[PDB]
Design a protein around this ligand. Structure first.
Ligand code: 4GM
Ligand code: 4GM
Lengths: 240, 240
């Protein structure tokens, strides 16, 4: 229906088996809700040793991805995607991914994800080939593959049919399952009460309290409902 | 030497092949700089159908991980790790991972990473079994495996021997490799000059400018050197 095609450019395409063969994303792939298609720059080399890296001008300790195989791999993915595919580069210099950003990217029916290795890719390729640069967080990894897979997994959840408290901007409430007592610790009685409205308000209150204690800046981004304002006040009063 | 042991609790241990079999982390594993060891809660079930999920008290659409197999898997990993292993739970409610946080976690010789699935794990297990809760970013994924792999990859880079501009808190400068001209776009002459000190100052200036334009809040966290203050001022003047 609202299926998604994701093209991937990567020197290690077999890494993507982690999402295409397992769990909820693996089911999405098998049910044709999600298609992940990989192109390896190594297949676009012409020298005997299939060289995919190159030295940076100006010197420095690191290598970059070699332009010609990377560029040809990208052009080949773009031709397969046809019109309307947004090309994304994963890097620490990119726009910081968050849930609102995930819902934005989920609007695209087609994506091409370029996974950098070594010190990354030539700046002029970013200018000529990349539409948007994104980061999954403020840390450095050995490659863009885990960030690409993270992005795929996150947007996959918004494909209808893929799934069987972040939505209103709060951290999740605590959850409990069997047994009723675990190392002396009991389940909050309200969760046993069967009183659906009390349970809803307890969970909402807990989410508000948790967000306030752990991530108070997230509250500032919100326009709380009357009910949310009440429950948050009660929680802060009980904490005091 | 300063090798690292990482125990992993996961319903999909084969996902970790993505880091243990490929690239720089795969080399780290083969060279015994990094050891990743997985325990699957499914192996700790006793019923015919090997059930690893359970219903949450209070109702709700989701499932949680079943306590008994998860708990037994964790205890088994802890016994293998011996003393000094810090147990980490990956979740959106956790401390936000950044590079300074990565360098903190990299101090541990032993880690145990618990990967949640479904709606996560019982709150009382977090209290009784988990030392620290971490998030790789403000978004929701289908499982804690990609966050665990992200964390492993990031800390792996600080293991001596694993590697062959974030360090001073700035975004990276632009990088260029062959060819000298790419779709009309030329390499900045300074990078061709062989003038090492000019090249260093150009790169530093670019990093400062890039950080200022894309991530100005990161600059506020820094105490800039005289040189950095000068180059940033020049860059802002040239932008104006
Ligand atoms: N925070 C991130 O989203 C992220 C993305 C990619 C990455 N490493 C590959 C790479 C390294 C350096 C430059 C460009 C690159 O593509 N590490 C972290
Ligand atoms: N931002 C993160 O680090 C992150 C970690 C785990 C995750 N999903 C598994 C899971 C989902 C919900 C609750 C607990 C859980 O363990 N999604 C994102």
């Amino acid at each position: 229906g609202s299926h998604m095609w994701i093209g991937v450019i990567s020197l290690f395409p077999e890494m993507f088996k982690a999402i295409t063969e397992f769990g909820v994303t693996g089911r999405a792939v098998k049910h044709n809700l999600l298609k992940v298609e990989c192109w390896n720059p190594r297949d676009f080399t012409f020298d005997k040793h299939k060289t995919v890296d190159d030295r940076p001008y100006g010197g420095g300790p690191g290598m970059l991805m070699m332009v010609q195989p990377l560029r040809d791999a990208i052009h080949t993915a773009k031709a397969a995607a046809g019109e309307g595919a947004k090309v994304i580069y994963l890097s620490p210099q990119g726009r910081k991914l968050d849930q609102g950003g995930v819902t934005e990217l989920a609007q695209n029916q087609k994506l091409i994800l370029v996974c950098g290795r070594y010190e990354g890719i030539d700046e002029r390729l970013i200018q000529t080939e990349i539409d948007e640069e994104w980061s999954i967080g403020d840390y450095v990894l050995t490659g863009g593959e885990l960030p690409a897979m993270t992005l795929i997994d996150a947007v996959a959840r918004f494909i209808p049919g893929v799934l069987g408290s972040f939505a209103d901007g709060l951290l999740d409430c605590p959850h409990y399952t069997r047994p009723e007592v675990l190392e002396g610790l009991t389940v909050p009685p309200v969760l046993m009460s069967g009183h659906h409205e009390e349970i809803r308000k307890w969970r909402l209150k807990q989410s508000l309290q948790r967000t306030w204690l752990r991530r108070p800046e997230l509250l500032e981004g919100l326009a709380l409902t009357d009910e949310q304002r009440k429950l948050l006040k009660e929680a802060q009063a009980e904490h005091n």
